[PDB]
Symmetry: C3
Subunit: 544 residues, 3 copies
């Protein structure tokens, strides 16, 4: 019939005991009923915004999947304004889940975001749209820059790992969820024209905590284990950080963070919603091109005396030292000539030494002059502009270290600069592309626990977690979560093996390049093992 005769004869024609692979006994589970519960908080104000949510109900036996709502207000007025990508996560400074017995679980804003970086849905929900993240311009004092919106922040906790099995049980105890918010300055990208002073005064965080509550008939509570993260931020430009009292750790993550305290946090360009490396680069090239190639009737005006604008010769090639720039613009009027800004942005430590000129990073600029709009429409640009260039704060171009003026752009271009205060920036560039760690050494006391010359620990992290944006992580727990006691790195207090000392070898950069002056901070995250006890309320105990 339908089955092939070769198969029928292979089977039809018994002694050995076999496991039933075609049927299973449908086990009756614990009688329960779930419900999505949303709660309004209590706002408190260094005058940091803190939201407190109290969960106390006889029928809320267990809970998991915490989602924080945030009502973003209508933004009216003049100037350029936009929210940072995944705005909802960037709002969060700290989250604490505590009971009468103390803190059960807590996370720093950046660590919660890092744990959700692989979750596209959670990231989209937190605020990733052209409506929120593109930089909008307000023309009149009553013009709407941003329409009001609601964002949803998934607060991933260890209670979600195995759904109902991992859920936080409530032993007739009061659970308080505390959310500490970062200043609105962090989540906003704006220009000088925008009235931030008024905005910061008028802005208020409007949060609402949602969770999946479970009403369990005759609950049989058993003790569980929980991994609690603990971060350590090293001193400015120090290649070392130490995590004290490490007794039972499931993982250790190492990454870098830039420090922009020495700057005004202003940047030349921002790509808006489009977040690819190419998008960041293109946004920068587009901003520079306005001043880089000028079609004018006589030498261009409105630029500093320090600026050296050169007329493009008949051959099209302009020679800036060793660098040759080919500039050819079509439909240029007979009364006008093509000009090139040979030193748009320049840096140097000594008056007659090596110079880093952004105009030298261009090799070919082709376009057509529009008689109707009286502007140059660029066709193709050949350049060597990188993600680092786009990530250089404006302050460093005009820094005291620089012997030259630095910023030779027009006043128009300078006015379009945007303040970026994103709290979750990693590495030294906006895309965290440049790996500035040449070598990583992890020491458990005096002994060397781990060492690497390549980011193989990041490769394993990215592979094992199926993430495209991982960190140099040392996982100690390869045992299945919830159903087993996690495997940890056991300490030896007597031998001085109760600390994790991380040492890195930062890459050596050129002093005549502005990124050299971007202050660095080594972030070391340690996940400590704790035991959840439900005897006379919920409580946690550090495994030692």
């Amino acid at each position: 019939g339908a089955m092939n005769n070769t198969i029928i004869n292979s089977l039809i024609g018994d002694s050995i005991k076999r496991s039933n692979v075609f049927a299973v006994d449908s086990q009756i589970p614990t009688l329960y009923m779930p419900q999505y519960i949303s709660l309004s908080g209590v706002m408190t104000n260094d005058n940091q915004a803190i939201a407190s949510f109290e969960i106390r109900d006889q029928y809320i036996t267990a809970l998991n999947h915490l989602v924080l709502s945030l009502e973003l207000p209508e933004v009216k007025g003049m100037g350029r304004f936009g929210y940072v990508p995944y705005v909802g996560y960037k709002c969060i400074n700290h989250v604490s889940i505590s009971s009468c017995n103390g803190v059960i679980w807590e996370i720093e804003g950046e660590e919660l975001y890092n744990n959700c970086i692989n979750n596209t849905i959670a990231l989209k929900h937190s605020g990733y749209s052209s409506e929120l993240n593109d930089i909008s311009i307000g023309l009149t004092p009553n013009d709407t820059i941003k329409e009001p919106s609601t964002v949803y922040v998934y607060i991933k906790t260890p209670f979600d790992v195995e759904d109902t099995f991992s859920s936080l049980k409530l032993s007739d105890s009061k659970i308080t969820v505390t959310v500490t918010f970062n200043p609105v300055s962090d989540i906003v990208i704006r220009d000088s024209s925008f009235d931030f002073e008024t905005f910061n005064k008028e802005f208020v965080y409007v949060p609402e905590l949602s969770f999946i509550g479970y009403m369990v008939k005759n609950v049989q509570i058993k003790p569980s284990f929980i991994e609690k993260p603990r971060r350590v931020i090293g001193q400015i430009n120090q290649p070392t950080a130490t995590v004290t009292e490490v007794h039972a750790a499931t993982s250790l993550s190492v990454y870098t963070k830039p420090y922009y305290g020495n700057t005004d946090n202003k940047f030349i360009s921002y790509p808006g919603y489009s977040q690819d490396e190419k998008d960041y680069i293109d946004a920068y090239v587009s901003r520079l091109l306005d001043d880089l190639v000028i079609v004018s009737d006589g030498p261009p005006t409105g630029y500093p005396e320090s600026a050296e604008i050169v007329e493009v010769p008949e051959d099209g090639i302009v020679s800036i030292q060793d660098a040759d720039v080919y500039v050819k613009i079509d439909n240029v009027p007979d009364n006008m000539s093509v000009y090139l800004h040979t030193n748009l942005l320049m840096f140097g430590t000594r008056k007659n030494s090596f110079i880093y000129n952004i105009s030298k990073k261009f090799s070919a600029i082709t376009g057509t002059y529009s008689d109707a709009t009286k502007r140059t429409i660029f066709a193709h640009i050949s350049h060597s502009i990188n993600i680092i260039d786009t990530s250089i704060p404006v302050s460093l171009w005009t820094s005291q270290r620089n012997v030259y003026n630095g910023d030779n752009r027009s006043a128009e271009s300078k006015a379009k600069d945007l303040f970026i205060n994103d709290p979750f920036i990693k590495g030294i560039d906006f895309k965290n592309k440049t790996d500035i760690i040449s070598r990583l050494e992890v020491r458990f006391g005096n002994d060397v626990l781990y060492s690497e010359n390549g980011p193989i620990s990041r490769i394993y992290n990215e592979l094992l977690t199926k993430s495209n944006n991982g960190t140099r992580t040392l996982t100690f727990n390869f045992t299945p979560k919830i159903f087993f006691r996690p495997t940890t790195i056991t300490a030896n207090v007597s031998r001085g093996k109760d600390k994790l000392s991380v040492r890195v070898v930062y890459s050596t950069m050129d002093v005549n390049h502005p990124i050299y002056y971007v202050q660095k901070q080594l972030v070391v995250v340690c996940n400590d093992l704790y035991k959840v006890s439900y005897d006379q309320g919920v409580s946690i105990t550090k495994i030692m």
Copy 2:
């Protein structure tokens, strides 16, 4: 201390079986709805799962614009029924099968998602090939696939009949007026083939199982209520809206083809409007209705349509010709002195260059505020009775390029289902409120828990693992009248002078009822009560 072996495991000998991919040709039957019946009866086919329906799409020859809807294979399905001699074992509505597969990129690609199928192709001669023949594969996801061999549909020497009801070819096709649909609808025939993974099991040990059967109730047009009766044991409840285009001719100004992003829909619309929006002509433009207000662009480039300023600057315009802006391309107004929804006002800057060689304007950059809703407005609503103005002030050429879209699985009020029109949801078990929300938090949980970007407002009752456990259901009380689920929605208030306000809405409520699979004297299902 006693420790569990985490580095080694005893390799259990499984049930002796042999799988085989079996493909069957059906029996076609013809309201003259196309129905395909597939009979599965073999002593050696002990169990089956992973149903895949193949469809041989024919060569499309002739004149006019033609293209298939994205995921054409899923859109073909109106209903699927898996039945035995004891009756229906499992059944699903076309849209619900598609909804269950929306997160499966592979299944969606297989069903027909290509530039070859979905881009709108134009036929120039009556014998010109518009679309080349193709075969699409529709994965009919069933609860028998959840845990592979463990969840498989067992055949107790019983006849299993797979019945596939097909939607009319009108639903899966996007065409213009020039296309001879009358002939196509007559000539078109569904050519199906059902494939499945069959298992020959030596000494099968069948045990009873549980199955979730989806039930849907579609509310009346513009009625914000729907009720699912005889709810005794439900595992979930999904709530969504569907647009109803009966009050229209199902014609739309633009369609982006294969490129399905929100931006792609918007760009396709802007491109279609631009042909009539900015005109380079020798004297005032002709071929437009008297109702049209085409204004010559002044020297400064700014044309003022009320409070809205439109900057229009076209290069290489001949000395004998002038640049013109259509100030009321598409307009809507309920009353003569009320708010006006003007599509030309949705543009702020239009720059381009006139080509002397092709005698046409090549647009460079467009600054506009056009949205996904604009692209989703049926042409009929612009020329609606409620509109005191003419409405459609486009050229006869532009109007002839309009496409009929009859996609049966459209949700919300826009083509991308972006706009959430439910302001408040209220679910009642019997008479008592089971759940209520002011925000789409149930949709957020659905999208998060299922790792889907296109979820619905879903109330999940079962958070217990499937197949290995009896699903956690909402327990009913007949005596208290708690034997039904009533859904009441409050729609988001829109301004009356916007054309989309007149899109008829339909509330869809899906209930997953729990059934017990019994294998005593053939396969049979029993509703848990």
Copy 3:
């Protein structure tokens, strides 16, 4: 707060605890990421040997091969193939003192990782590596040095610690055989490949997750070992002998470019979509297709038929009409179309495969500043096959015409592509050239299909967009169960799998007809892992 309707609904039968679980103490162990430098050995194939023997290392899994790609300096066009790290691999073999435990062919390891986006990205998929870079001076940097990571997916990773390869105080040798650097590199004639091939050396490093296990309790396990059979060139048959217990059988086709110089007109670089391949081809052809010149164009062969575009704009190449209209053309110059850019035919007065006929409309604007044509919109019928035709076939002895009527400038821009993992007859493996598939277990027919339904099931069951015609026999969960296999009957002759395909035939006047095909049949055989006196495998028969 909980709703009153829920509280009233809840407030004898045995129930499984779904809200709590006993946290079982696992086997005491400690993991460590261990990286090892190899031993390089050298038609004169590069082989890297990695020896794993340590008292602490009890078990291992997740093999990752690191490769140090050197700085590429000099003149000419150069770029690496996408997923360069996987393409480097010819063979991988994990062996003990008792012999080979597990081994895979380079292409099969890549096929097993094609659904893993992360593993593919790590192996080298960037604009920095895969876009074709041009070197202007002999000391100009074409490619900056980079490190690529190749995830060698093994059956020991399936269930993490449970599936891990245990080392019974035995020496485990990981042997990696490398394909020639010619395979992983896309370059032009201007590039000094001769020097590069001499100077290039594979710099590998094997990383793995080692486990130090206190009081390990080793139990025997099962392993699926792949076997590949490549049929004779263009032959629609291949047989895999000694098939006693197989879990699956995959069937696919590969092109053979031995009859060519492996040179191709265009390559899209990093952008790998079908449209990207097509656009890169159109862009390369357009330079010679539409010429703006002062009088008839020069620098083309005598065989070229360059026609001046009439006032009408339409140029008629036989039945095919090409509309060409270029703006801002100088008064002294005219618009010209190359009516036979690439042509193929087997007879002097028969059907022609002309590439110029594959164009219907070409619009653009002439730039006075750069003295070149800037194309705006192109209407064409160019396909993935056209882009996949090797240059040799256009100039082949089968062709009555000259074939390649492009300029010397265009011909110099041709790139050598030697990617070892190309499937089908096109670069995107779009064209399905198998009309029918027949699989025989011994002399009896096991499976037959007229459509690629086995490929559809493979793509669906593995959640992959790039699958093959696969016959899976094991639908039982891995590691926790003995896999389900086709059972042989040596006495009845049923101890081999014979695959017979029916290839759809191409048009003899179309250059792709002369692209050689190869049938590839992959069989996964079941083996038992024994740990008694070292690690050893035994074929299930």
